Paper text:
[name] is a hepatocyte-specific [name] dependent enzyme, belonging to the Fold Type I family, catalysing the transamination reaction between L-alanine and glyoxylate to produce glycine and pyruvate, thus leading to the removal of glyoxylate. [name] normally localises in the peroxisomes and failure of its detoxification role leads to increased levels of oxalate, coming from oxidation of glyoxylate, causing calcium oxalate precipitation in the kidney and urinary tract. Many pathogenic variants of [name] cause PH1 (primary hyperoxaluria type I), a rare autosomal recessive disorder. Our results shows that two forces generated by the salt bridge between the conserved aspartate residue and the pyridine N1 atom, and by the Schiff base linkage act as opposite springs and are responsible for the fine tilting adjustments of the pyridine plane of [name].
[name] is a pathogenic variant of [name] that causes Primary Hyperoxaluria Type I (PH1), a severe disorder of glyoxylate metabolism. Although the mutation is conservative, the variant shows a 2.3 × 104 fold reduction of the catalytic efficiency, whereas the affinity for [name] is almost unchanged. Following our novel hypothesis, and to understand if the low catalytic efficiency may be due to a non-native geometrical strain, we have solved the structure of the [name] mutant at 1.8 Å resolution and at a similar pH value (pH 5.5 vs 5.0) of the wild type. The structure of [name] shows that the interaction of the asparagine side chain with N1 is loosen, going from a 2.6 Å distance in the wild type to 3.0 Å. As a consequence of the strain relaxation, the torsion angle between the imine and pyridine planes is reduced by 10° (from 36.2° to 26.3°) and the cofactor tilts in the direction of the Lys (si face), assuming a conformation that superposes very well with the geometrically optimized reduced internal aldimine. Clearly, the H-bond between the mutated Asn amino group and the deprotonated pyridine N1 is not as strong as the salt bridge present in the wild type enzyme. Therefore, in the mutant the opposite torsion effect is uncoupled and the spring mechanism, responsible for the tilt of the [name] pyridine plane during the transaldimination step, is lost. In the [name] variant the H-bond replacing the salt bridge isn’t strong enough to keep the internal aldimine under strain and the pyridine plane is tilted towards the si side, whereas in the S187F variant the salt bridge is conserved but the counter pulling force of the Schiff base linkage is lost, due to the rearrangement of the Lys-209 loop, and the pyridine plane of the internal aldimine is tilted towards the re side.
Numbering used by the authors:
A (entry chain A): 4 to 390
B (entry chain B): 5 to 390
Write the structure that this text describes.
């Protein structure tokens, strides 16, 4: 009868984790209140008290997105899981789908779109670029899409995509606007209803400083109508918006068991939303803008070059630096964690090998942290081998 | 000029009630798991995170009793693991046989339909289980590529026998997928020895970790089918080729796919360390004994167990026939209102027919049996009887 697999020796040792100052494109470090919420005991996942916390979270999401949309809720997964929830519900097989492919995030949207049978049309742009109204209109006119995807904060390239006017333009072409604000939310201006966005989503782990694992999403009535009139069922059950809507209190029926929400992660997310509700959006935008401007000045004084030349196009939360000539970017990243216990990153997708990425996210977006990463980079530039 | 003002409810502190959770799960968290949930973040692609991931993988191989290389965590709840299994294993048009003896088989049918399989339910009333002979007829008639069976049917209180089923499926060139969300750690289960090709469970049952992560492992036969199919799975998030790579299961450097739930992995790591320290067979013994003690106390109250055959009772989730004359909703409310204990009614086909009492992991104790027994005694004495 004897078990062949034995208790793993490594698990018989205590868990211990290193102390790391996370100054990459995210996830970010957690403030005390969010760590404390993470250590709390479970409550019933369909209890009145749980529903009250969920309702508070929904109010918080409506605040940070600046929307009145009733159909606003949490997706029980990471930012990719929220994008897939948007696409698997809004798009039916054969639907035309226009995508701003200007970095890895647009590429990921193309991949998901293809998999669920859309007719996908990328607008491809080198890393560093953004879309104009004219570029979008040309795509809308040519491809007659039911949905456009735009990345607001392109954290792979350091770009801040302008959003004014795009929603109205899409709507003239009978197109819904979907916007990724995972890296932008809380760090730079964003107004869902004022900007005519139809589907907006973000993640817990960037400027909100919650642990990775949950994501935030909201749907206009136009998007709501399309999702509820579909004649095909979405390919996913877990992400079916009719079930999720009901369980999050968004429709007129009693909440029915769908899947078990991540109770403890929702405590933490609730607290992250309370913190930014206390600080205020505009104050948070100012904090990130100023920290970013300070970082840009210090990096240039090190002799590094910002990847995005035009300051109005720079994403405050994630700054791209050209890799300095003669260095191997891997040495610089390794040097910084090895000798300073600071995380930064290289590039990602099309910016792989071209940039270093430095994040300033929420409570970590400070002049004091700018000074730490500046000194770490200075030392890497002094000691890493140069060709 | 901002449209939306800060919500006043969020300007108050978070406060949660104390609840003793003795339903079908999620279960309460032991102090070590709560402490891990309170730790600081590390880098989601850091060397230290990969080591923790590797320790988790060894833990899963331990609790499943497998050596499969393709073993990993799904970043979502038990439904998400089931969808990962089916969306990668099944291509559109594949024949899919399902043991629909409660809500969990019904859910498998729904997902299977959505992803274009040709679904064949074997439908049984709540309380039933499948024999080898009934599965063999389904295999012969429908020539499925995959069979789904629920091991611990937490909606009906049933313990499904597993010996023999994998071997049967393989004679018919069918893969065996088993849901062990409710049974893992609380009753015997051997992935390799029972010939199971896909096995999954959840964090929040007997493991006593918070909900939100799930455990999955694939045999070489399942691995071969997933890596052979000519169509891409409908999901990117759940694509096994990307996930296998990031979890260190394949021959290539780990590439970014999606950000794993760092803090939840700390907690799941500790949940696996705890049962590694206890030892699997000791855990099985604890659940078996706690459930037998529960069964006698409940019968001594005049209650009737829903599953008549003791060998068919799932130790982790016990169903009780709702007693004649009472409104089950009054009984459930009485227990939370006056004793701060959570129990449940039924689910899916058992709705209105049962109360469900869970004994899960560190909560599967004689002490907790005494607590819920006293609460039900009081409920029977004070709830209205028709
Ligand atoms: C608890 C349970 C599930 C739960 O899945 P979630 O998606 O995490 O809610 C699924 N199947 C069984 C048998 C369970 O007991
Ligand atoms: C961090 C980020 C994501 C990542 O999502 P995960 O699935 O949580 O890893 C997606 N898009 C953008 C713009 C991001 O900054």
């Amino acid at each position: 009868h004897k078990l062949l697999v034995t208790p793993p020796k490594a698990l018989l040792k205590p868990l211990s984790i290193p102390n790391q100052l996370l100054l990459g494109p995210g996830p970010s470090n957690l403030p005390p209140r969010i760590m404390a919420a993470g250590g709390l005991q479970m409550i019933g996942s369909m209890s009145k008290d749980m529903y009250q916390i969920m309702d508070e979270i929904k109010e918080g999401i409506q605040y940070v997105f600046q929307t009145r949309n009733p159909l606003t809720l949490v997706i029980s997964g990471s930012g990719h899981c929220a994008l897939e929830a948007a696409l698997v519900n809004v798009l039916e097989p054969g639907d035309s789908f226009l995508v701003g492919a200007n970095g890895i995030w647009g590429q990921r949207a193309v991949d998901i779109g293809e998999r669920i049978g859309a007719r996908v049309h990328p607008m491809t742009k080198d890393p560093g670029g953004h879309y104009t109204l004219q570029e979008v209109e040309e795509g809308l006119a040519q491809h007659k899409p039911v949905l456009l995807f735009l990345t607001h904060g392109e954290s792979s390239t350091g770009v801040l995509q302008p959003l004014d006017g795009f929603g109205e333009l899409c709507h003239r072409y009978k197109c819904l606007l979907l916007v990724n604000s995972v890296a932008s939310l809380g760090g730079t201006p964003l107004y869902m209803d004022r900007q005519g966005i139809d589907i907006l989503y973000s993640g817990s782990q960037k400027a909100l400083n919650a642990p990775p694992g949950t994501s935030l999403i909201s749907f206009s009535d136009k998007a709501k109508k399309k999702m509820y009139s579909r004649k095909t069922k979405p390919f996913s059950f877990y992400l079916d918006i009719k079930w999720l809507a009901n369980f999050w209190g968004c429709d007129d029926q009693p909440r029915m068991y769908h899947h078990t929400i991540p109770v403890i992660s929702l405590y933490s997310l609730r607290e992250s939303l309370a913190l930014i509700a206390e600080q205020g959006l505009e104050n948070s935008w100012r904090q990130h803008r100023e920290a970013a401007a300070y970082l840009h000045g210090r990096l240039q004084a090190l002799g590094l070059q910002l990847f995005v030349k035009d300051p109005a196009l720079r994403l405050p939360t994630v700054t791209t630096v050209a890799v300095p000539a003669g260095y191997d970017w891997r040495d610089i990243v390794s040097y910084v964690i090895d000798h300073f216990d600071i995380e930064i990153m290289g590039g990602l997708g099309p910016s792989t090998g071209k940039v270093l990425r430095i994040g300033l996210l929420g409570c970590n977006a400070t002049r004091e942290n700018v000074d730490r990463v500046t000194e770490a980079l200075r030392a890497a530039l002094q000691h890493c081998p140069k060709k």
